[PDB]
Design a protein around this nucleic acid. Sequence first.
RNA 1: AGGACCGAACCGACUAAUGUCGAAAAAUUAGCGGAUGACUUGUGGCUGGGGGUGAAAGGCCAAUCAAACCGGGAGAUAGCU
RNA 2: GCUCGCCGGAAGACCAAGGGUUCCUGUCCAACGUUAAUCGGGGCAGGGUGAGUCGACCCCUAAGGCGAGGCCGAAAGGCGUAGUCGAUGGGAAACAGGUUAAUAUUCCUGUACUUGGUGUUACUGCGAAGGGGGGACGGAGAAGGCUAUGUUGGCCGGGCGACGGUUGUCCCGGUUUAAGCGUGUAGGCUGGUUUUCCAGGCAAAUCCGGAAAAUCAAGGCUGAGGCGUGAUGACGAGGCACUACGGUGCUGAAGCAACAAAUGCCCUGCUUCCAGGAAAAGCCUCUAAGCAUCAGGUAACAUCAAAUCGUACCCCAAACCGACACAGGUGGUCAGGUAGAGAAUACCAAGGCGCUUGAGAGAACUCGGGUGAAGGAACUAGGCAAAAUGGUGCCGUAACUUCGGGAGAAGGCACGCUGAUAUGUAGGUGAGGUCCCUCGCGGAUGGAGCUGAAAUCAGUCGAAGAUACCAGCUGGCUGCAACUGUUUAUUAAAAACACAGCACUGUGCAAACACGAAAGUGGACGUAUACGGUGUGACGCGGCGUAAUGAUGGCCAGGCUGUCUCCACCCGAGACUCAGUGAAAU
RNA 3: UUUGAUGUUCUAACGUUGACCCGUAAUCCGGGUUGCGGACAGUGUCUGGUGGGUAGUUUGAUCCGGUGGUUCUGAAUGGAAGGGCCAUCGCUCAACGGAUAAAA
Lengths: 260, 46
Amino acid sequence: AVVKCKPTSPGRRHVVKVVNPELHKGKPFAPLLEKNSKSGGRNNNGRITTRHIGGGHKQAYRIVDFKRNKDGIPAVVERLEYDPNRSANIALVLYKDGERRYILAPKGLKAGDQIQSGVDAAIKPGNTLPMRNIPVGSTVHNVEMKPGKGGQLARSAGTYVQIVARDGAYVTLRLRSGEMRKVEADCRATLGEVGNAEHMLRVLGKAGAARWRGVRPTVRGTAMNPVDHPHPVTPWGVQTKGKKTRSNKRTDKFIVRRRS
Amino acid sequence: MKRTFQPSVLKRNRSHGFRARMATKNGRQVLARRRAKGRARLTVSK
RNA sequence: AGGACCGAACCGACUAAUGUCGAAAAAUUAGCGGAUGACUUGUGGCUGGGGGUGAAAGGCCAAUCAAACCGGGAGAUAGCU
RNA sequence: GCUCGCCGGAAGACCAAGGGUUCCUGUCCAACGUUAAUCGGGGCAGGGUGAGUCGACCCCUAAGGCGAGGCCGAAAGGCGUAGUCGAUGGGAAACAGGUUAAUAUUCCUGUACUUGGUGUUACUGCGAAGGGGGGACGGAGAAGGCUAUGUUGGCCGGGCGACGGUUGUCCCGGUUUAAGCGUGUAGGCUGGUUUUCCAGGCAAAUCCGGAAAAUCAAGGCUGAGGCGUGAUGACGAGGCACUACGGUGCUGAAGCAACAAAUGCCCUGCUUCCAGGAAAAGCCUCUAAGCAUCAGGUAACAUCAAAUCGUACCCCAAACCGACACAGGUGGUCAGGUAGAGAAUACCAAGGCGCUUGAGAGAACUCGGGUGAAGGAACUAGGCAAAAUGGUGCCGUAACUUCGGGAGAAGGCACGCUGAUAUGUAGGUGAGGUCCCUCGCGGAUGGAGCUGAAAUCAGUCGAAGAUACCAGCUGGCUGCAACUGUUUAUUAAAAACACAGCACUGUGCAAACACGAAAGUGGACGUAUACGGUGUGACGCGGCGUAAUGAUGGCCAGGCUGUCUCCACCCGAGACUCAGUGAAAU
RNA sequence: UUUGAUGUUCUAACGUUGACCCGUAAUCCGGGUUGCGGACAGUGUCUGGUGGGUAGUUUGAUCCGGUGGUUCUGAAUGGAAGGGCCAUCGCUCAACGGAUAAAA
């Protein structure tokens, strides 16, 4: 749901919150938890490589099962949880064998539902089926690019990819960026679209939102001195605002269409 | 105003201690120079 | 609940006065803004000099920064004093 | 020794970091103390630091460092695995009183507590770098029970007292007792018992998890505080006897109730919020390998050990950092009485000090203040500085607006004390007796007693009752900027920087981008509802307006006043004289 | 028969920051298997273009020589290249005694 806060004061005047009543109001499953130490944009050399990163509230990394190698093991979704590392909420799944894991929660998944992975699975949203088995012209997410890789595409909230054609051992997928990609059929994918589609309605209200979310102030090039910044070019002299930098010549064979 | 120097034995030892000097190759050269010059205190220590 | 309000500790020095061979190589008195956070602080480490960091002033890098300090080239050179 | 004054949320007591004998005694003024000094944190000599329970040490580890192999690089060297360091964190244990001139939670008196080795006794399956639980956690906020602590009352010993009265509802001092032990309450958490099965927990498992049933509905876990032992023990006001006259020995009465109550405990509790809030070790359990006449473990007993290091002193300062015995700075803990919402403010208890030059007079002038006739900004680039209001309660509060705000707008009236309402009300707390009880820290009556606002009437004193400190000046026009916030440490706090939002562009992940000769890293253990760069900076249509906001620029109006006509007097330090020490630029 | 450029397919070179197992209680690393691409990408030398991002600087002369004749000479001998002798010629290189072929 989407709620607009009363303008009782600045910092609440322009606040829009995305409240999810069905989220779990409790601690996460401790066994699957793990630490996530912030880096602040530093690297092994200790210098800053990426700008505008630092601070933020402490968060714990949740291990999410993307590969979904539990083939032919029906499971029940216990509940949903808020994962700070992902813009989309996660779902706790308990398999019949007696083991618990985390998955991505699609739009049509709620607590108490039944899920199943493997080729011998139905077409209900959230099931894990190879794109070869998945009917063409369907919407999927968490698509794999190599067998057993785990899944990298359509992992953000409300993101999905369309299966637009079936060229034998390869399949054509349209992404939300307007990209047409050719992917091997043996790769796994998840049916349905990612949940938490209302992630756009949030406006973060004030600076503090981003500040404790992990973003630091951005300084414009014009305000910088000539020595610090060239000032449309990047701080390192690369001309921006309409200059492609894609030079790989390795994965282009899998590229069918470019963004328009 | 708090002055530049704030004493701390741990910091002093770990920054300019003999083991810290010997950890790096250049610190060994610095110790050799100090010994050649003949200063009584090669490095800072308790 | 409020990057909410008045207001102690705490943070800074916006105004005035004294202090310029002062108690202090930016200090003291009363006012002054914040004082639940974009807050501050103790401790422990990382980012090292065409480099680091910088809510960005050409600011800070141990009272020195439009390019630190230490030893060497080096008794640099000076059509200059 | 007696007065006067200051701090007393500190100018008191403990520590942490930092100094290293500055600590105590004897002894002297050679040099220092901005003067003398017999004195000192000064010179010389002596004494002083007692740990199984304090901390370090040791087990584990976060950030981070080193790094066997290994990758890369002309070499130097850079990265990193297994591993090893790394407390700012997690693991086991002590309290009361007494003592020296210096140590005490270390020494003495008493009660204990914890970890392992050894031997005896009765049993038993033991056995991991492996698995499971726990360790193990954010912000904000309200209540209940508590306690430290303090008030009153009763009790104990004393007093009746140099200026009126004070055997009385009067005054002074005390009225303290820990850790451990047993009961385990208030409160919080959770449904338990039994059986059967399961490709799950990278092997197995009686351990965790999951699925079925029969049974009861209670059990189990955590849990401050109080109660008795600790303790007919110590302590204890005061008196008595000697004093190297500083001080030492003996003695020792009562040691209770109520109230209020914390930031400290129940409470890592409970309710909500998105920013979703460390790791490992010790600890309980399961088995693998191997052994099960052993070994090992369990429960009780006796005994041994718990090594080594700091233990003085200062620690908001004279001892630490500032070249100084420097108006500066330094983290945490305890932090009481009255008035007070308050750790603010005014006076005090405990405790600590009068700050290392004084003595005379009270010139101009300088510094910080008090008062003031009339005008009340006419002074000044400028209400700069000064002057003025400032709190509680009742009524009321405009234009605009994003409907929240403006607003404490502005503006009107009562605030003291005593008696009554009410021999202190309402409220809070709550004794004893009585009745029950699934029988103890168990549930009702009850108000004894204590504490205790706010309001009405009447009276009353003062020129003035928020009478002291504390404590917004007010409104209008107006450019800028969404606001909060940050910046040129040490002349520019702003219209500058940053900001949530908006738009363009790039990146398909072995992603772009950046550090790196390269490895490898942050991006991201994310991935198109994700990230980097660029321009602007809320909202309605870089341009026009914009509520609120502003130590922002300017103007005006009401009060106010020494800014000014015009300054005058007074209060403190200099300036002047005397004594002691004693620079400077040039 | 040498063949190269190009097109389709394939693996034995090569990449694997895909999966499984071992050294190994090991996200590194090396080794064995397989799948995915595959003569693509990438790397080493050369070369065309961009490249204030970075670095060194500024605000008939002269060098080069075009042609001629002259065996003057021409580094062992004979040639040739390169030098010397005489003639002429290319720049208002006019900043005209002209500091670089090359700078706001």
